[PDB]
C-alpha cells in the first residue's frame, strides 16, 4: 500500500562498544550553575575527570559567554570536545515561559561557541530525553526537546557538532566508560543512548505494514477536541472524524470562529450530522482550556485530542535565533501540550494525538526552534505511554492542498529536498493505519530518497538513514 509506504518509525539499534581510552586532549564541560546537582550530572563530571575544564553558563547572555569562552580557549588552546550538561536545567526561563532554561542555554552555547571560535565538537548530554530499547522509560520530555535542536545544529554547523547522548538512570562505571569512549571516537554515530545492555543508536526505518484491528482503535464517538481545528490539516482531520462518527467536534484556534474558512468548515461538518463548537482559545492558556472542557455535554464526554495548533514562521538559523523567537515557537507545542496532558490525564481518553514534524524527526536547516518544539511532542507521547496513558505523535512530512506548505516559498524548499507533498487523503489514511495499530510514534511522509539522502548527507554522514534501504541505495 501507498499509505503503508508513507509511514516510518524511529528505532534504536545496538552499535559497537567504544574504545577504553579517554580522549587525549582536554574536554570543556559546560554546567548550568543552578541545575548542577542531579545525580547524572555529578556522575558525568566525575567521569570526565578532574583535568576537564569547567565552564558555568550563567543566565542567558550570548556576548558575555562568547567573551568567557574566548578566554578559556586562549589559555588552553584547542579542546578535544565540548560536553554540555545544560539539559539538566528543566525549569522554565524567567523571561520566556515556554522555553526550558537548558534549551535556551544550549542555543546560546552553540551561538557563543561559534562567536568565540571554539571548534571542538559539541556533545549535548540528556537523561531520559529519549525512549531507547525495550521497556525504556522517557522520563523527561523537556530534555527531549533538546534533541530536536541538536539535530538542526548538526545540519547547520556539522563541523563543530559532536552529537547527542542520553545517559541511563544510574551512571555506573560501565556507563561512564561508554560515555568517555564515545567522546574519544563515536564511529560516526551522533544520536546515541547509553543503557545497561549496551550503547544504542537512532535509526529511521519503514514502519510495519498495516494490520486491521491490531491496536483495537475504539470507534470515534463523544466529543473530540481538535486544536488548530480551523487550520489546514486540522479541518481535514475534523471532516474525517465527522465521517467516522464523532458526536461533537470542538475546534479551537486563536481566531476561532473568525479564522479563515471557518463558516464553510462548520457547514460542511454539520451537513454530516455533527455538533460543532468553534472556539477562540489559545492552546497555551490553561484557564481557557479548562473552561472549554468544563462546558462539554454530559452525553458527549471528551474521548480524544488531536493537537494540530502550531506555527512554523519566524524561526531562524541556529546562529541567529533569539529567545523571543524560540518562545513564540514553543508556545503552541510545549506549553499547550503540557496543559492538554495535565487536564486529560484523568479522563481515560481513547486517543491523544500530537502533530509533530519531519523537522523534529530528521532535522531541517533553518528551523531549530520548530524542531525543538516538535521534538517535545514526540517525547511527551512516549512519556505518557510510560504512565499507562494513551498517546501518539505523528511527525508529518509535507502536506499538499491545505496547510502551511501551500506556499511556493515553503512548498518549494521541502519538495526540492525530496520531502514531497502528500495528498491529504493518503496522509489521513496513513494516520488511521497508525491509530488502528495503536503505535506511539511515526513519521508520515512521502520521500524521494534519491533526492533526499545525498542532499541530507552532503557535509556529514547520517547513521540515522542507514536503515532505509532506499537511502543506502541512493548513496551507493
Ligand atoms: N502542513 C504541513 O506540511 C505540516 C504541518 N505540520 C504540523 O501540523 C499542524 C497543522 O499544520 P497546518 O494545518 O498545516 O497549519 P495551519 O497554519 O493551516 O494550521 C495551524 C493552526 O494552528 C492554530 N494555532 C497556531 N497557534 C495556536 C495557538 N497558540 N493556540 C491555538 N491555536 C493555534 C492556527 O490558528 P490561529 O492562528 O487562529 O491560532 C491554525 O488553526 C501544525 O502543528 C504543524 O506544525 C507538521 C509537518 C508538516
HEC letters along the chain: CHHHHHEEEEEEEECCCCCCCCCCCCEEEEECCCCCCCHHHHHHHHHHCCCCEEEECCCCCHHHHHHHHHHHHHHHCCCCEEEECHHHCCCEECCEEEEEHHHHHHHHHHHHHHHHCCCCCEEEEEECCCCCCCCCCCCCHHHHHHHHHHHHHHHHCHHHEEEEEEECCCCCHHHHHHHHHHHHCCCCCCEEEEECCEEEEEEEEECCCCCCCCCCCCCCCCEEEEECCCCHHHHHHHHHHHHCCCCEEEEEECCHHHCCCHHHHHHHHHCCCCEEEEEECCCCCHHHHHHHHHCCCCCCCEEEEEECCCCCCCCCCCCCCCHHHHHHHHHHHHHHHHHHHHHHCCCCCCEEEEEEEHHHHCCCCCCHHHHHHHHHHHHHHHHHHHCCCCCEEEEECEECCCCCCCCCCHHHHHHHCCEEEECHHHHHHHHHHHHHHCCCEEEECEECHHHHHHHHCCCCCCCHHHHCHHHHHHHC
Is residue 363 within 8 A of residue 147, CB to CB? The reply is no
The C-alpha atoms of residue 71 and residue 66 are separated, in whole angstroms, by: 9
> How far, in Å, from the CA of 227 to the mean position of ligand 1?
8
Nearest CA to ligand 1 atom 37: 254
- Ligand 1 mutation target, pool 98, 308, 401, most atoms within 8 A of CB: 308
Atom index in ligand 1 nearest the CA of residue 406 equals: 1
Cell 541512493, residue located: 474
Is residue 427 within 8 A of residue 6, CB to CB? The reply is yes
CA atoms within 13 A on the CB side of 304: 25
The C-alpha atoms of residue 459 and residue 452 are separated, in whole angstroms, by: 13
Q: Which of 66, 156, 154 is nearest to 109 (CA)?
A: 66
The C-alpha atoms of residue 347 and residue 384 are separated, in whole angstroms, by: 13
Backbone angles phi, psi at 53, to 5 degrees: -85, 140
Strand partners, 355: 394
Q: Is 54 annotated as a binding residue?
A: no
User: What resolution in Å is listed for this PDB structure?
Assistant: 1.6
Cα-based angle 346, 347, 352 (whole degrees, multiple of 5): 105
The C-alpha atoms of residue 96 and residue 327 are separated, in whole angstroms, by: 6
- Chain-centroid distance of CA 332 in Å reads 13
Q: Is 123 annotated as a binding residue?
A: no
Give the count of beta carbons closer than 10 Å to the beta carbon of residue 51.
Answer: 8
Atom index in ligand 1 nearest the CA of residue 230 equals: 41
Q: Is 232 annotated as a binding residue?
A: yes
Q: Residue 235: which residues within 8 A CB-CB, separation 6 or more?
A: 229, 251, 261, 265, 402
77, exposed or middle or buried, with CB in 10 Å at 0-12, 13-18, 19+? exposed
Q: What is the CATH number of domain 1-476?
A: 3.40.50.720
Is residue 130 within 8 A of residue 80, CB to CB? The reply is no
Rounded to 10°, the helix 101-116/323-330 angle is: 140
The C-alpha atoms of residue 375 and residue 122 are separated, in whole angstroms, by: 19
7-14 vs 441-444, strand pairing mode: antiparallel
Q: Is 255 annotated as a binding residue?
A: yes
The C-alpha atoms of residue 227 and residue 289 are separated, in whole angstroms, by: 10
Q: Is 460 annotated as a binding residue?
A: no
Q: Is 147 annotated as a binding residue?
A: no
> How far, in Å, from the CA of 130 to the mean position of ligand 1?
25
> How far, in Å, from the CA of 53 to the mean position of ligand 1?
44
Long-range contacts of residues 178-181, Cβ cutoff 8 Å, at least 24 apart: 178/17, 178/18, 179/44, 179/47, 180/22, 180/23, 180/47, 180/48, 181/17, 181/18, 181/19, 181/20, 181/21, 181/22
> How far, in Å, from the CA of 278 to the mean position of ligand 1?
15
Cell of 207: 514502519
Q: Residue 49: which residues within 8 A CB-CB, separation 6 or more?
A: 22
Backbone angles phi, psi at 233, to 5 degrees: -70, -40
- Ligand 1 mutation target, pool 227, 261, 309, most atoms within 8 A of CB: 309
Atom index in ligand 1 nearest the CA of residue 256 equals: 38
> How far, in Å, from the CA of 253 to the mean position of ligand 1?
9
Nearest CA to ligand 1 atom 24: 309
> How far, in Å, from the CA of 291 to the mean position of ligand 1?
22
Atom index in ligand 1 nearest the CA of residue 311 equals: 25
Q: Residue 128: which residues within 8 A CB-CB, separation 6 or more?
A: 137, 138, 139, 140, 143, 166, 169
Give the residues surrounding ligand 1 with Cβ less than 6 Å away: 227-228, 230-234, 252-255, 259, 282-284, 308-312, 331-332, 355, 357, 396, 398-399, 403-405
Cα-based angle 241, 246, 252 (whole degrees, multiple of 5): 70
The C-alpha atoms of residue 32 and residue 87 are separated, in whole angstroms, by: 8
**Most distant CA pair in the chain: distance in Å?**
73
> How far, in Å, from the CA of 228 to the mean position of ligand 1?
5
Is residue 20 within 8 A of residue 184, CB to CB? The reply is no
> How far, in Å, from the CA of 229 to the mean position of ligand 1?
8
Amino acid at each position: 500500500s501507498h499509505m503503508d509506504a508513507l509511514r516510518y518509525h524511529i528505532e534504536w539499534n545496538r552499535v559497537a562498544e567504544p574504545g577504553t581510552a579517554r580522549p587525549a586532549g582536554r574536554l570543556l564541560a559546560v554546567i548550568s550553575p543552578d541545575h548542577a546537582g542531579a545525580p547524572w550530572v555529578t556522575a558525568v563530571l566525575d567521569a570526565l575527570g578532574p583535568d576537564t575544564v569547567r565552564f558555568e553558563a550563567k543566565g542567558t547572555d550570548r556576548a558575555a559567554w562568547a567573551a568567557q569562552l574566548a578566554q578559556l580557549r586562549e589559555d588552553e588552546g584547542e579542546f578535544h570536545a565540548v560536553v554540555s550538561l545544560l539539559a539538566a536545567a528543566e525549569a522554565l526561563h524567567t523571561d520566556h515561559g515556554s522555553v526550558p532554561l537548558g534549551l535556551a542555554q544550549t542555543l546560546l552555547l552553540a551561538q557563543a561557541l561559534g562567536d568565540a571560535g571554539l571548534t571542538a565538537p559539541l556533545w549535548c548530554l540528556t537523561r531520559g530525553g529519549v525512549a531507547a530499547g525495550r521497556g525504556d522509560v522517557l522520563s523527561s520530555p523537556v530534555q527531549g526537546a533538546l534533541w530536536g535542536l541538536g539535530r538542526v545544529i548538526g545540519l547547520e554547523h556539522p563541523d563543530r557538532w559532536g552529537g547527542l547522548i542520553d545517559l541511563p538512570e544510574t551512571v555506573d562505571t560501565r556507563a561512564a566508560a561508554r560515555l568517555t569512549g564515545l567522546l574519544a571516537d563515536a564511529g560516526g554515530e551522533d544520536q546515541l543512548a547509553i543503557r545497561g545492555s549496551g550503547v544504542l543508536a537512532r535509526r529511521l526505518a519503514h514502519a510495519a505494514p498495516a494490520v486491521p484491528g491490531s491496536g483495537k482503535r475504539p470507534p470515534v464517538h463523544g466529543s473530540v477536541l481538535v486544536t488548530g481545528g480551523t487550520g489546514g490539516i486540522g479541518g481535514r482531520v475534523a471532516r474525517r472524524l465527522a465521517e467516522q462518527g464523532a458526536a461533537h467536534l470542538v475546534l479551537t484556534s486563536r481566531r476561532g470562529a473568525d479564522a479563515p474558512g471557518a463558516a464553510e468548515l462548520r457547514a460542511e461538518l454539520e451537513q454530516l450530522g455533527v455538533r460543532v463548537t468553534i472556539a477562540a482559545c489559545d492552546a497555551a492558556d490553561r484557564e481557557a482550556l479548562a473552561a472549554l472542557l468544563a462546558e462539554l455535554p454530559e452525553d458527549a464526554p471528551l474521548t480524544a485530542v488531536f493537537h494540530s495548533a502550531g506555527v512554523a514562521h519566524d524561526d531562524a538559523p541556529v546562529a541567529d535565533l533569539t529567545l523571543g523567537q524560540l518562545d513564540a515557537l514553543m508556545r503552541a507545542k510545549l506549553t499547550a501540550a503540557r496543559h492538554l496532558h495535565e487536564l486529560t490525564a484523568d479522563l481515560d481518553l481513547d486517543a491523544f494525538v500530537l502533530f509533530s514534524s519531519g523537522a523534529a524527526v530528521w532535522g531541517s536547516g533553518g528551523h531549530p526552534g520548530y524542531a525543538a518544539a516538535n521534538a517535545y511532542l514526540d517525547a511527551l507521547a512516549e512519556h505518557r505511554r510510560s504512565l499507562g496513558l494513551t498517546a501518539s505523535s505523528v511527525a508529518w512530512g509535507t502536506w499538499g492542498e491545505v496547510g502551511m506548505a501551500t506556499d511556493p516559498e515553503v512548498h518549494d524548499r521541502l519538495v526540492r529536498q525530496g520531502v514531497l507533498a502528500m495528498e491529504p487523503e493518503h496522509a489521513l489514511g496513513a494516520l488511521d493505519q497508525m491509530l488502528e495499530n495503536d503505535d506511539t510514534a511515526a513519521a508520515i511522509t512521502l520521500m524521494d530518497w534519491e533526492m533526499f539522502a545525498p542532499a541530507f548527507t552532503a557535509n556529514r554522514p547520517s547513521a540515522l538513514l542507514s536503515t532505509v534501504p532506499e537511502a543506502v541505495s541512493a548513496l551507493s
